[PDB]
Amino acid sequence: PRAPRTYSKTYSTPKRPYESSRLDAELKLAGEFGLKNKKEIYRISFQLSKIRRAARDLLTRDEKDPKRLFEGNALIRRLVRVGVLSEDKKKLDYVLALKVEDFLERRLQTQVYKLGLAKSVHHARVLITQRHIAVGKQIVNIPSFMVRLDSEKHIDFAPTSPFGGARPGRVARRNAARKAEASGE
Amino acid sequence: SDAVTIRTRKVISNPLLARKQFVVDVLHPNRANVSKDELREKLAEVYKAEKDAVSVFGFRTQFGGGKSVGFGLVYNSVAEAKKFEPTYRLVRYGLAEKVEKASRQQRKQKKNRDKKIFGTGKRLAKKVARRNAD
Amino acid sequence: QRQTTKSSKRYRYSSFKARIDDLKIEPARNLEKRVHDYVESSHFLASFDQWKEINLSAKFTEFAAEIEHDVQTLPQILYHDKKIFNSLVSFINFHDEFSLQPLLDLLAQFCHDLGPDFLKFYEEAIKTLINLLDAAIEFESSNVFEWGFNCLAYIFKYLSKFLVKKLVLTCDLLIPLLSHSKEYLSRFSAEALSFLVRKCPVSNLREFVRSVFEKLEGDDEQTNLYEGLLILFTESMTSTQETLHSKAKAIMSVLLHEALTKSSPERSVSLLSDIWMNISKYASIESLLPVYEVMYQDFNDSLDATNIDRILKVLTTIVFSESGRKIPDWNKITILIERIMSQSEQDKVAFLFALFIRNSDVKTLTLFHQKLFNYALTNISDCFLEFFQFALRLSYERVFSFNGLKFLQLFLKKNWQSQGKKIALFFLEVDDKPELQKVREVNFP
Amino acid sequence: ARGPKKHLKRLAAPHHWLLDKLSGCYAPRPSAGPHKLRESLPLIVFLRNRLKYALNGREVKAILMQRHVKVDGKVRTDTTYPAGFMDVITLDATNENFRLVYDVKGRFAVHRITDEEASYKLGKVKKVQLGKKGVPYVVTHDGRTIRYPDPNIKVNDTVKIDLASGKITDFIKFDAGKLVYVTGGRNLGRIGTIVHKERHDGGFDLVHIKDSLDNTFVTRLNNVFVIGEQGKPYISLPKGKGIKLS
Amino acid sequence: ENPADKRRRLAKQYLENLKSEANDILTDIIASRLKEDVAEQQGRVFRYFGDKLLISEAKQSFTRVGENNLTCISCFQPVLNKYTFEESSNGDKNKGRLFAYTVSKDLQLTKYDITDFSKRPKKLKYAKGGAKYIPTSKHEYENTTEGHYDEILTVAASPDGKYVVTGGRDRKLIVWSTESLSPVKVIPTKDRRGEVLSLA
RNA sequence: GAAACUGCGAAUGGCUCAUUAAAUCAGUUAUCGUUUAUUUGAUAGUUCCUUACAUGGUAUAACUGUGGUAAUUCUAGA
């Protein structure tokens, strides 16, 4: 006796698990994008599979069908604002041409590494979770964050970081205390 | 350096319960979590009412700090504050008193026993006294 | 039996008359974070903004429209005073309960800003206030009364000096409210005028008290104005928590003088009696003392005139008030008694000695009883029996431990042929009471 | 179940109250009164959930007991009073009158209302009979009984009612070409003019209605409610004026 | 003796002045003047001298300055308050002394008097930054040396006349007390590329 | 304001799925075939009619007091 929350699984293991072309596919993806889990890859794979099934059904509908027009325009603007789809390809056909690398390229850790706040994809991952990179005004410590367009313009170091702001971290000021004390003695 | 800001939004003047009810934004950078006492002091300064009339509650600090958001009430007179505020929030502010009461278990147990006694009981007390005394 | 052991609960009922009887007036006795006293870009404008945010009513919304367009700054007030005042009075005359708290509040503040220029509106400001108060009676609202009389109190507070200088006109303006045929109108209007009179200095106070007593002879038939003055003066003197103050003693002096004047009304003397009764009941003796010395000194100043019965009146009041626990010095009282006896060289007289016997101290009765009874048998001859029965009924054992029997005997010896009927009536009365055994065993001529 | 129910779950509520599905387990079951269970708005759902003048049930009870709220001129202190349709709820300390009328989306829309319009109320004449001692009476759509009506007031009509006196100022006959408000089913909230009344004997009469953009729909007589003549409604219509668009 | 009475006195003096000036103009009007003095905070343009100006006869005057590449300027003008009635300026020597402050890439702050609209801006006082204020850490939040060491870029004079505040490429922001030009407080912008580009 | 009488609630809630295969239940009807506390709206001069209405009557509780039983939310007599 209350109303039950709605939950939902966010991924789905692919059809035939062990298939060497896909094993190497996941290897290349995880390596070049800094991921850690066939589960993260499957999360993106599931999202995109759902998207493309939506688009395909709309295509099979008739041109100018009201349902197609409404839902399709919604989907296209959602992807364009996510940044996956370029402006000039506002068509459900390019939606069908999307891919997993596009979604991973939108993830946050990739965007840090690209914009240069980090030196490697793993440096970037660590920073994000270390609470060093704030989007706009708001610290973000989720590496999967899918920056939008203007947001990817606004990423920076957080005003609390020893890197973009306040007093240096504990190791640095402990070392400083050590050196000042040793100079005193 | 450290300059707390108090600002209000969504002010709704509710004269039914004789108050103004609004939403408070507190900007604290390089600081944690401004106190409700200081919030009430400064809100009273701004709204020209008495710290006994002002009341705030429900303050949540956003992820990353520097800003917390809450709800606030500013009653028309300390009279109406005492008239309408809940006992618990008055108790928090020290306007009312904490009542002492037993636990729920003791209360319900005393209730059941007294349910088992009819009348005023004092003749029962005398009767058991003498029945033992025999 | 007023509600005295509060119920545990939180929302009681409190009917209208209960609220009003619990209501009082003084704001300085009251206190809180007053907005206008707080912020200072202009008092009227301060209250005006607070209220525009707080009050959401048709009349005040209209009024706020017009005036917020006009006023925003003190020079603008000073320039456009009349238009603002007419607007306020227009709405107050509209008499709308939801808008009156802001309208009256703004009126008080408007005077506060405009002080010594407000007098040219003062008269019809007050007219509008009294009309509002009677209409409020019609549509009972204790909140309305609280607001209205506080507006009056504040207007007096802000225009203290000028009103004090021209005091009596204020009393003429308020006399509808003062003598109004409703307890609480009398009560509240008198409390406001009480603040003002206590503020007033001595000379204008003398003029005022003369004028008001002659007004009392004007409304000799009326009693309402009478207790209106009663409650006014008594509050003006007792204003503090348990202790009247220096202005109160000056008030007592001026009233006592202007009642002892031979042109003063004897009903006014009764009024002073009542005031003293209330003060004696209220304050404590240590506080009362300077009043006592002032009164004794004033009696010593002017006891010697045809006002002797008047002095009797006031002194009977003093002795009866409550008791010796408020009486400082029965010895001084005795000095006054014998001095008045010498000056006299009647019924009030018997009443006075009876109260003296009942209420005075044994250590003074020891050395004054003899002269007291001699005074009785000398001056109040025919009434002495009146007296002695009255004393018996008040407190017999005091005279019995003292010499009731011997003085009764000697009175019988001195005179029996004038009022033997009265003597018989007295004895007829006293036979039944079993506490009068000594009176049964007195002797006869 | 052996008697009347006194509780209402939260999922089981009327949907048009817009009650969140997590704040609790129970919804205000509206007390018995003028309007039916499912087409009424209780005073707590109106004072707390719509007006946001309260934050609690205990705040709503404080307001009512302080005696501010009047539902059709009379002061109502029941916190689950079933305020219904075409109702007038006045909050004087705020100087507001509210006609409760439907929004296009189906839900009750607040409709701010002036004093001279809060003075009256429309009611759908719904049962005309001959009462005891031979006085005839009308029964409107919110319980109200009104005696000595005009003889020309027939079932399914509208009567404009002075609230201050419980009397009938005037009326409107149910004929084609009047303006119609709709109160049930898929189209509720849609105002149009009444084109045809297809009448079945023993079944349900249907009505064909046509809104200002000449879009036609078919509803039941149970759900039609006559408002005013063409182009002039007797009440003030909420914004959008009952036009469903894309 | 009372604050309310004092405010009444000042206001009535204001009215005496207004009536005298209205008579002067003569040789509605008072309400209009009061309404304008109000009308400042309602933000609609009211000051409509758009065409009363005499541009062709405007009197022009250059005044050379020593340092090179003046970057920016800020002028301070005392007004008279309308809530109270004292003045805008701070001290009592001033009594309506119009000031100007110029900041130059050469790291110079220069205050001039421009009170007289017929003589050249007179160079009252100045303060020059330079290299001796370079921070010894150079690599932290704290940047708080009491002077500029690079390219002062904007200046703004406080409307109450007590301070003037300058900022530039050194990523600092310094408030000076006006009279002695003395640096009273320094606030870093605490960002590696947080250069101040404008002040208002 | 304890006790007790009077009024109201205790028929809702919560729990389980044993029974039940045109039964339940689902959608759809009818009551011109019936009861309805409550809510809400209306609604009750009867002037007279042969020999207290400034307001009839008796009880009972709690209580005082006398008791019974191993014992219960037992209860007797006055």
mmCIF file of C-alpha atoms (C1' of nucleotides) in Angstrom, chain F residues 29-77:
data_model
loop_
_atom_site.group_PDB
_atom_site.id
_atom_site.type_symbol
_atom_site.label_atom_id
_atom_site.label_comp_id
_atom_site.label_asym_id
_atom_site.label_seq_id
_atom_site.Cartn_x
_atom_site.Cartn_y
_atom_site.Cartn_z
ATOM 1 C "C1'" U F 29 -27.808 -2.142 -18.243
ATOM 2 C "C1'" A F 30 -32.624 -1.742 -14.668
ATOM 3 C "C1'" U F 31 -35.056 -0.242 -10.074
ATOM 4 C "C1'" C F 32 -42.270 2.294 -13.192
ATOM 5 C "C1'" G F 33 -38.956 -3.272 -7.708
ATOM 6 C "C1'" U F 34 -36.458 -1.214 -2.755
ATOM 7 C "C1'" U F 35 -33.738 0.657 2.499
ATOM 8 C "C1'" U F 36 -30.320 4.902 3.301
ATOM 9 C "C1'" A F 37 -27.126 7.329 9.748
ATOM 10 C "C1'" U F 38 -24.671 11.462 7.706
ATOM 11 C "C1'" U F 39 -23.874 15.776 4.305
ATOM 12 C "C1'" U F 40 -26.411 19.380 1.427
ATOM 13 C "C1'" G F 41 -31.104 22.187 -0.175
ATOM 14 C "C1'" A F 42 -35.966 22.872 0.906
ATOM 15 C "C1'" U F 43 -39.934 22.147 4.501
ATOM 16 C "C1'" A F 44 -44.450 21.846 9.937
ATOM 17 C "C1'" G F 45 -48.969 29.462 12.883
ATOM 18 C "C1'" U F 46 -53.837 24.428 12.403
ATOM 19 C "C1'" U F 47 -57.874 31.126 15.887
ATOM 20 C "C1'" C F 48 -62.107 28.356 18.497
ATOM 21 C "C1'" C F 49 -64.374 23.558 20.049
ATOM 22 C "C1'" U F 50 -68.274 23.254 28.085
ATOM 23 C "C1'" U F 51 -65.272 20.936 34.851
ATOM 24 C "C1'" A F 52 -48.794 24.630 35.634
ATOM 25 C "C1'" C F 53 -46.480 26.863 30.529
ATOM 26 C "C1'" A F 54 -42.550 32.241 34.584
ATOM 27 C "C1'" U F 55 -41.830 25.764 32.116
ATOM 28 C "C1'" G F 56 -44.694 18.618 34.804
ATOM 29 C "C1'" G F 57 -43.063 13.691 36.834
ATOM 30 C "C1'" U F 58 -40.354 9.554 38.758
ATOM 31 C "C1'" A F 59 -36.141 7.130 38.475
ATOM 32 C "C1'" U F 60 -30.828 5.591 38.303
ATOM 33 C "C1'" A F 61 -25.172 6.125 37.583
ATOM 34 C "C1'" A F 62 -20.541 8.150 39.534
ATOM 35 C "C1'" C F 63 -20.272 9.083 44.895
ATOM 36 C "C1'" U F 64 -20.971 7.662 50.686
ATOM 37 C "C1'" G F 65 -21.329 3.122 53.174
ATOM 38 C "C1'" U F 66 -21.956 -2.746 54.386
ATOM 39 C "C1'" G F 67 -20.206 -7.327 51.966
ATOM 40 C "C1'" G F 68 -19.206 -11.893 49.323
ATOM 41 C "C1'" U F 69 -15.330 -15.571 45.863
ATOM 42 C "C1'" A F 70 -8.929 -18.905 44.998
ATOM 43 C "C1'" A F 71 -9.652 -16.114 40.805
ATOM 44 C "C1'" U F 72 -11.794 -12.117 35.770
ATOM 45 C "C1'" U F 73 -12.741 -5.434 32.667
ATOM 46 C "C1'" C F 74 -17.354 -10.548 38.319
ATOM 47 C "C1'" U F 75 -20.561 -7.952 41.443
ATOM 48 C "C1'" A F 76 -25.081 -8.118 45.705
ATOM 49 C "C1'" G F 77 -27.892 -5.174 49.782
#
